[PDB]
Amino acid sequence: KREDVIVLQDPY
Amino acid sequence: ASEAKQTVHTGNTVLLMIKGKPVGRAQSASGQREYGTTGVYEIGSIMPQEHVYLRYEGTITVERLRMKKENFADLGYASLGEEILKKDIIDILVVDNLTKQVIISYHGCSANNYNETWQTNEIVTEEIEFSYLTASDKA
Amino acid sequence: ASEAKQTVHTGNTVLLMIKGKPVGRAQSASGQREYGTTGVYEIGSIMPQEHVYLRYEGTITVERLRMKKENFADLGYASLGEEILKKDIIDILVVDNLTKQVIISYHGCSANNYNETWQTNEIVTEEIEFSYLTASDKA
Amino acid sequence: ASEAKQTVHTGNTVLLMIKGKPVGRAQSASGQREYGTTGVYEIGSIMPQEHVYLRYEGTITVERLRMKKENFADLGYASLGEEILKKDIIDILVVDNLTKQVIISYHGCSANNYNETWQTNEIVTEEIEFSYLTASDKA
Amino acid sequence: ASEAKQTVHTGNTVLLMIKGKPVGRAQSASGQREYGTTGVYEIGSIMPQEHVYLRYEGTITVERLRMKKENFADLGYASLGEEILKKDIIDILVVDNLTKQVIISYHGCSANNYNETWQTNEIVTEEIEFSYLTASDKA
Amino acid sequence: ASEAKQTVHTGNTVLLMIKGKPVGRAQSASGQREYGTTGVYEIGSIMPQEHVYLRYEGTITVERLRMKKENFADLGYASLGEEILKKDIIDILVVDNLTKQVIISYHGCSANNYNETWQTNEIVTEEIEFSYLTASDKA
Amino acid sequence: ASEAKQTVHTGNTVLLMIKGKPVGRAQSASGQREYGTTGVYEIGSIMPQEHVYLRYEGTITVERLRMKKENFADLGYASLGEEILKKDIIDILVVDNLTKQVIISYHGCSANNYNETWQTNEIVTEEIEFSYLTASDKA
Amino acid sequence: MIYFVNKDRIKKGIPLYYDVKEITYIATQDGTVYEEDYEIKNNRLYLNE
Amino acid sequence: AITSVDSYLLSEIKPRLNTVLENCYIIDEVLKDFDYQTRESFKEAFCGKNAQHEVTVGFNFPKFKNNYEAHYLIQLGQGQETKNSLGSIQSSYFEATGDTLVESSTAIREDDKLVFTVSKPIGELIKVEDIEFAKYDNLQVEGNKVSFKYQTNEDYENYNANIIFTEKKNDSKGLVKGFTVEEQVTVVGLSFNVDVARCLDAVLKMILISMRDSIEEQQTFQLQNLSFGDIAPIIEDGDSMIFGRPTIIKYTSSLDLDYTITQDINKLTFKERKDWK
Amino acid sequence: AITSVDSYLLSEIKPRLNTVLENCYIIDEVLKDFDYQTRESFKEAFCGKNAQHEVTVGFNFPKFKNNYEAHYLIQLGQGQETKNSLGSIQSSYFEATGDTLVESSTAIREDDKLVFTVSKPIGELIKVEDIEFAKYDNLQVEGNKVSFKYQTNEDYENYNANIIFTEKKNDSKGLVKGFTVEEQVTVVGLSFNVDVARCLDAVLKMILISMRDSIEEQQTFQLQNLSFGDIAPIIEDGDSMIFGRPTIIKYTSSLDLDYTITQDINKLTFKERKDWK
Amino acid sequence: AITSVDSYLLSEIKPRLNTVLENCYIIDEVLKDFDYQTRESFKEAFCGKNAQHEVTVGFNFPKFKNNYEAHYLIQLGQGQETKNSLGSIQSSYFEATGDTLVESSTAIREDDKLVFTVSKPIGELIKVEDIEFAKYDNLQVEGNKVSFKYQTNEDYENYNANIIFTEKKNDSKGLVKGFTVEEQVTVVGLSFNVDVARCLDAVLKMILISMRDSIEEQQTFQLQNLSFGDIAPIIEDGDSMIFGRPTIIKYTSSLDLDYTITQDINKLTFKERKDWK
């Protein structure tokens, strides 16, 4: 499922 | 199943009769009764010593839907004007519907007041109140 | 199907007429009547011995929506001020709507009080009460 | 679980007994009591100085559904006519249903009034009121 | 469609005016009127022989939401204290909203009582009652 | 969170105590009080000139569910019969439930009337009313 | 949007103040006022000729939730016992909440009665009634 | 995305709803916004006052 | 106390149901209004000591299969608190009292007293059946024994009585704190035969009427009020339907706790101290 | 007037919300009843000038994505007319009056009067703060100026005051015709963190209590009444749920129009005419 | 204040639940009405210091799995404002007062006074336990200390007392502005064993009865009212069902703010000025 509601940085 | 050991009278169980005709569309009958019970007091205690009966009083009040025929006015039991002076006393009987057996008799009824209400969303209502000389039952 | 053997009057079945005009938008009529029935008592028993009629009294009360024309004030039957002193007695007839046949007549009506209520979510209401000399029916 | 340390009487917990017969279909009993407490006042202060008891009064009122048999009239406790003059005083006991133990006794009851109401959608109701000489409990 | 042959007054149809200003936020007006109609009786019949008018009386009662300005107290029509002794009589007019035409006039109004109720979930309410000398309508 | 700067008493916050025992299952207490305040008037103005206190009066009324034990009759505070003449005055305390601190004291209570109602779908109710000599609070 | 041309007072708009402290948790205030308006009648007409003011009277009644502190008894404005004889008259002000501007003043208040009701599912309620010498507003 | 820009958002920077990798178009009522007049740091958008 | 209406009903219904079903003329009286064949078939199947079928009682949501021929399912329902006391004081006591009990006992002579022995310490004596003692009789209670003067009573030296009393837990003061609750339990007689469901309804109504006189719901669980549902299929998609008619039993009862008070005061003392200002 | 409760609430809530959030000790007082960690986390995240997160306010049904971390959604609800005046006359006026206003001002000397200047023509003066004038002071209002006699008042030559007044539109007569309406608006604090939703509820209740004293809803929008819903997931099928607790704000207010009257009468005149029949 | 009934209930229930469960005879008294085996199994499993199972309490919508053997789920519900004050004035104060507190303390001699020391500045003293002072005793409060004359009281030189008092924030005037709200919270005891759900219901009712006497809900959160739901499967499609019986706890409480007043007046002054007309 796509991460729309809570959005976090890319790992790098 | 039908048991006698407990039974209560209900609106359907009881006929109201006047001069040997049943009163159609009678809505209620209310019988009231008073003895004038007066307590006896004396110097020496605050307690009642005795009670005495001094004056009997009672009334029967009947509410009825005003029929187009055989009203209390048409039956002659009610009075609208001076002809009240020419109505003899009448006896009103309350009678068991099943057995045709008299439950209570009101003797010597005499009219106190007579009402009619004409209203726009309702059936017209008669109401009448009689003073009576005595009441009795026989068994 | 239409049966006479049972029928009751209803708000739609009955016209109210004054001076040969029907009263529009009348909401209720209440007729009340009293004979002054007094019980006779004596030394020797607590029971009533007799009842006697001593004073006849009765009133007719009418509630009506206040029309913009032909009010009781405009018709002249009501009075707002001293002109009450110049109103002759009037007869109020309650009449069967179908047969045009008089059900009850109130004779010699004379106004006791007159009310108007002006209120913000309602139609304005007239109410009037008359004392009358007698009532009668004819058949 | 059943606890005595708190318990209240309820309509199911209490028998009403007259002359050692339980009264069937009794709907309510209301006991009322008054001592005539009068306050004493004097010149020199607005305060009550004392209260004194001057006149004891009390009544027991019972409402009951009118049974077809063993009415208060059939039991003889009520009176419809002059035979009220021939009824001796009776004692009315209110009794714990479980223990058969007297909760309160009304002594020397004497009838004030007796009513019956006959109505078209209801069971017929008796109601009776007695004056009594005293009340007591024993434990 | 708009018809005159039947029409009733309603809360929206009627202005209330005092001294040529309309009374804002008036919630009700109640006009009451009495003539002291007394019946004549004599030895020889129980019937009323006649009715006579003996004493005219009437009041106008107005309920209003207490505005922040132009209250009855601010307008001066009401009185809170001894200055009631310095208020001349005023005439209260009830007027048709459409035609600006006087429906009824209350002449010579004089204040009987004045109330204000302050309550926590409601708008504050004024209420005032006047005795008046006469009422009239003109057409 | 618990704040003192605003707090109101509630049915759960307040104990009722008589002779150092709490009254179980008390349903209400109503305290009423009157001073006989009379206004002074004179020739020369319609205004009241002064008010004077002339007669103190007050009552405490308590409603309670009739317990099977420790009734007001079993506790001896109520009286059913002549033994009312042998009951000394008692003091009724209303006490803060948390602090055990007296909120108001009714001093010199003396019974006016005592009621019990026995009814078929309900718990039995005691009710009692006392006249008292004075009330006070201490802080 | 906020307009002055129409506005009414509401429970939230109005402070009640006594001795320069606002009364917390006041639930209602009711001010009543009467002038004794008497109509003049004479031989020669049934009409009132005149009205006269004869006796001013008024009361202010306040209902309040009984706080745990700063009750009318704790504030000293109410009286439970004989100390009513030592309370001077007080002035009660009803004040606009926004402008802090006096709406109406009740001058010379003096207590008629004081009530407290303790009940099991409710907050405790104070109620007090004062007679006052006059009322006024200033603008 | 769309944001109303106010003095706080000028001083503090608009916290963007999405994790922007790059901008393909940026505009305002006055027209396109040139790259000297905006910056992204830490997923905050900073604008010329 | 805290109470559990469902477990009370299960405990009360099961023995009463058994004792009616083992007694043919009771069922013959209860079912007098039913059709003759319905009555006789029910009495043949379920009633008397030789009955090959049996009724059963239990709570809802078991993990096993039930006797769907005839089964009373008990089902705990809603409730709400209805009446509160001032200070929540339901009562107060000087001696911690347990449940009410009724026990049969016989008098015996001991040291020229009559005594009745009871199985537990008597916290309060409510009634010795069919006896009211005079002061001369020197009625005394001590521990688990009631004692009664012999001298004038020798004819009663072996008299048989029922004692109504209540236990004591301990000698302590406290307040009974709590409130009244009105609470509902549903009961349904399941059967795959509709005439059995109708008979189980009749039997249950008889049982509840009989239950109204029991000490348990005279002292607690007061004001029993009954409501009745339609007869309907409870389950509809087996090889046959299962029918039942619900009844709702509503009770008014007290929920409360013993708040013991340790504080006791046994002497006031007075002192005068002098203020020289 | 005609009124729009939703736009009033948006305009009133946004500045108040900002001014609370920029002021740490206010939040520290509002959240005193919450768990310590909830309080400190909220205060760290959303509160003070350095706050990196932000709350937002707006109407429902936007076409863009919102700040679902913390967002007050405003949602116009039902209403009904409740009380009517006779003739629908809500009021009457001799001079068309605008909105109520409060403005700060300072006295100045001019020609041996003190005057206060106001930004707009004064239709009515309600209050000069902290002053009650005597007749000797010769209080007069003219245009957009209030004027006040200097002679005895020289110490106040630079006195600072607040003027409460109302605009005038124009010199015309009319009737304010209309009625009262009772109307509802819903507000919900959306957050994907439940503890943030609970804190946003607390902050909103504080804001509404503070709002009750404002002139806007003292003069209009009277009798604010609050109702509160359950906390529940508003959206349930993202990568996370979004929670909120609704509140309903109900207001009583007047809807009305200025019906101007052009008719004016400035002289009666009398004539006698003779009837010769 | 602003209040949070859910967090109050969590904070109050958790310690009380622990202290009952660590105390066997309390459970043995609470469960006296249950079936013997139900009682003994519950007491064996969850009760006493050696209990291998445990109960748990927390809010709804956690992201992790809970102890579905026995868990009290707390669930914030509806509410509405019910009673308002005139002017919304809930109270007024001359000195900003904090929460109510009760603390144990001991007397000590100091300079021929007895004193009790309290952890915080005393804003108001409500009660010194078991003492009523006379005027001769010269009772005074100062800062965080209560002080009491030694001369006649030497026997009490080490007397142990409880002080009931309330904090002060600061010396300032204001109005407590606010209203009363009636608000609901639901609590349900989840268990996959129905007899555990029924016992958790009994324990929770006992806890709430005990809670009614606490200062927290004596001063705030007044008029606790309880309603009870049916026992039902909360979740139905695992390897087993999860059961619970809801209870609704309703409270009446005040929502309010401290509106401080900076205005203070400390002298009137009078002047006569002469009108020569």
Binary contact (J209, K80; C-beta < 8 A):
no
Phi, psi of I9 (to 5 degrees): -60, -45
I202 residue type, one letter = A
Q: Are 3 or more Cβ–Cβ pairs between E and G shorter than 8 Å?
A: yes
- Min Cα distance G4 → chain C (Å) is 23
Structure tokens, F101: 């601190």
Phi, psi of J14 (to 5 degrees): -55, -50
The label of the residue with tokens 């204000």 reads E116
Q: Using a CB–CB cutoff of 8 Å, tell me whether G4 touches chain J.
A: yes
- Min Cα distance H35 → chain J (Å) is 24
- Cβ distance D91 to D105 under 8 Å? yes
Phi, psi of I40 (to 5 degrees): -65, -40
DSSP code, position G53: -
Phi, psi of I118 (to 5 degrees): -125, 150
How far CA K112 is from CA of B82, K109, K244, in Å, comes to 102, 6, 62
Instruction: Select from J225, I134, G100, I221 the least CA-distant residue to K265.
Output: G100
Query: How far apart are the C-alpha atoms of J181 and J175, rounded to whole Å?
Result: 19
Q: Using a CB–CB cutoff of 8 Å, tell me whether E136 touches chain G.
A: no
- E67 to chain J: closest CA residue: J91
Binary contact (K209, I178; C-beta < 8 A):
yes
Q: Are 3 or more Cβ–Cβ pairs between A and G shorter than 8 Å?
A: no
Query: How far apart are the C-alpha atoms of G35 and F47, rounded to whole Å?
Result: 9
Apex G54 CA angle, G52 and G58, nearest 5: 120
How far CA K161 is from CA of B123, D65, E112, K114, K145, in Å, comes to 78, 63, 63, 12, 13
I4 residue type, one letter = S
Query: How far apart are the C-alpha atoms of D117 and B60, rounded to whole Å?
Result: 10
Residue B31 CB coordination number (10 Å): 21
* Integer-rounded Cα radius of gyration of chain I: 26
Element (H, E) at J198: helix J194-211
Minimum-distance CB partner of J230 among K59, K78, K255: K78
Query: How far apart are the C-alpha atoms of D130 and D127, rounded to whole Å?
Result: 10
Query: How far apart are the C-alpha atoms of K216 and I116, rounded to whole Å?
Result: 51
Binary contact (G122, F39; C-beta < 8 A):
no
- Cβ distance G27 to J25 under 8 Å? no
Query: How far apart are the C-alpha atoms of G133 and K181, rounded to whole Å?
Result: 39
Q: Where are the alpha helices (DSSP H) in F14-104?
A: 72-75
Query: How far apart are the C-alpha atoms of G106 and G94, rounded to whole Å?
Result: 8
- Cβ distance H16 to H1 under 8 Å? yes
The label of the residue with tokens 């946004």 reads J14
- E84 to chain F: closest CA residue: F46
Query: How far apart are the C-alpha atoms of J148 and J129, rounded to whole Å?
Result: 14
Instruction: Select from E82, E137, E134, E81 the least CA-distant residue to E109.
Output: E134
In a 3-state reduction of DSSP, which class is residue E118?
A: strand
Binary contact (E121, K84; C-beta < 8 A):
yes
Taking the CA atoms of K224, K229, K233 and K234 in sequence, report the sign of the dihedral they define: negative
Q: Are 3 or more Cβ–Cβ pairs between K and J shorter than 8 Å?
A: yes
Q: Using a CB–CB cutoff of 8 Å, tell me whether G119 touches chain C.
A: no
Residues of K in contact with I273 (CB under 8 A): 136, 152
G63 residue type, one letter = E
What burial class does residue J206 get, using C-beta atoms within 10 Å of its C-beta: 0-12 exposed, 13-18 middle, 19+ buried? buried
- J216 to chain G: closest CA residue: G2
Query: How far apart are the C-alpha atoms of I125 and I145, rounded to whole Å?
Result: 10
Instruction: Select from G41, G38, G42 the least CA-distant residue to G51.
Output: G38
* Integer-rounded Cα radius of gyration of chain K: 26
Instruction: Select from K105, K97, K94, K218 the least CA-distant residue to K167.
Output: K97
Query: How far apart are the C-alpha atoms of I239 and B103, rounded to whole Å?
Result: 59
- Cβ distance F16 to G123 under 8 Å? no
What burial class does residue I196 get, using C-beta atoms within 10 Å of its C-beta: 0-12 exposed, 13-18 middle, 19+ buried? buried
Query: How far apart are the C-alpha atoms of J112 and B34, rounded to whole Å?
Result: 91
Instruction: Select from E107, E98, E125, E105 the least CA-distant residue to E27.
Output: E125
The label of the residue with tokens 């004396």 reads B42
Distance of alpha carbon G86 from its chain centroid, rounded? 21
Structure tokens, J236: 């349930």
Mutate to test the interface with I, among G116, G118, G119, G120 (most CBs of I within 10 A): G120
- Min Cα distance G8 → chain C (Å) is 17
Instruction: Report how this structure was experimentally obtained.
Output: cryo-EM
Residues of A in contact with J68 (CB under 8 A): 5
Binary contact (G22, K175; C-beta < 8 A):
yes
Bridge partners of B21, per DSSP, are B18
Binary contact (I7, K34; C-beta < 8 A):
yes
Residues of E in contact with K86 (CB under 8 A): 118, 120
Minimum-distance CB partner of G11 among E116, E120, E131: E120
Write the CB contacts of C28 (distance below 8 Å, at least 6 apart in sequence).
B117, B118, B119, B120, C61, C62, C63
- Cβ distance K98 to K34 under 8 Å? no
Residue E2 CB coordination number (10 Å): 4
Please give the full DSSP string across B23-76, using - where no structure is assigned: -TTEEEEEEEEE---EEEEETTEEEEEEEE----EEEEEEEEE-BSSS-HHHHT
Residues 225-244 of chain J whose Cβ lies under 8 A from any Cβ of chain A: 235, 238-240, 242
User: What is the bridge-based pairing of β-strands J56-59 and J71-83?
Assistant: parallel
The beta-strand segments (E) located in J152-195 are 160-170, 173-190
- E82 to chain F: closest CA residue: F47
Q: Where are the alpha helices (DSSP H) in I91-191?
A: none
Binary contact (D2, I220; C-beta < 8 A):
yes
Residues of J in contact with G98 (CB under 8 A): 164, 213, 215, 218
- Cβ distance E24 to J91 under 8 Å? yes
Element (H, E) at D129: strand D125-131
Residues 20-49 of chain D whose Cβ lies under 8 A from any Cβ of chain C: none
Instruction: Select from C59, C64, C52, C76 the least CA-distant residue to C124.
Output: C64
- Min Cα distance E128 → chain K (Å) is 24
- E119 to chain J: closest CA residue: J223
How far CA I123 is from CA of D101, I3, I126, I257, in Å, comes to 20, 21, 10, 18
How far CA J148 is from CA of G99, J140, J154, in Å, comes to 20, 7, 11
The label of the residue with tokens 């619900």 reads I246
Query: How far apart are the C-alpha atoms of J86 and J179, rounded to whole Å?
Result: 10
Instruction: Select from C22, C31, C135, C12 the least CA-distant residue to C75.
Output: C22
Query: How far apart are the C-alpha atoms of G79 and G113, rounded to whole Å?
Result: 9
Mutate to test the interface with F, among D15, D42, D53 (most CBs of F within 10 A): D53
Phi, psi of K8 (to 5 degrees): -60, -50
Write the CB contacts of F99 (distance below 8 Å, at least 6 apart in sequence).
K126, K127, K164
Element (H, E) at I207: helix I194-211
Residues of J in contact with G101 (CB under 8 A): 127
Q: Are 3 or more Cβ–Cβ pairs between H and C shorter than 8 Å?
A: no
Please give the full DSSP string across I61-84, using - where no structure is assigned: --SS---TTSEEEEEEEEEEEEE-
Q: Please tell me the total number of residues recorded for chain G in this structure.
A: 139
Instruction: Select from E112, K209, I272, F23 the least CA-distant residue to G52.
Output: E112
How far CA K5 is from CA of D29, J35, J192, K13, K77, in Å, comes to 45, 12, 21, 12, 10
Binary contact (I256, K228; C-beta < 8 A):
no
Residues 56-85 of chain G whose Cβ lies under 8 A from any Cβ of chain D: 82, 85
Instruction: Select from K53, K49, K168, K47 the least CA-distant residue to K118.
Output: K168
Minimum-distance CB partner of K228 among I7, I78, I179: I78
User: What is the bridge-based pairing of β-strands C102-119 and C134-136?
Assistant: antiparallel
Structure tokens, K214: 């606490």
Element (H, E) at I21: helix I5-21
- Cβ distance D129 to D57 under 8 Å? no
Structure tokens, J185: 């608006």
- Cβ distance J82 to J252 under 8 Å? yes
Instruction: Select from J17, J15, J20, J38 the least CA-distant residue to J193.
Output: J38
Residue B1 CB coordination number (10 Å): 4
How far CA J27 is from CA of C36, F50, J194, J205, in Å, comes to 80, 54, 18, 12
Residues of H in contact with A10 (CB under 8 A): 19
How far CA K60 is from CA of D86, J33, J231, in Å, comes to 77, 19, 10
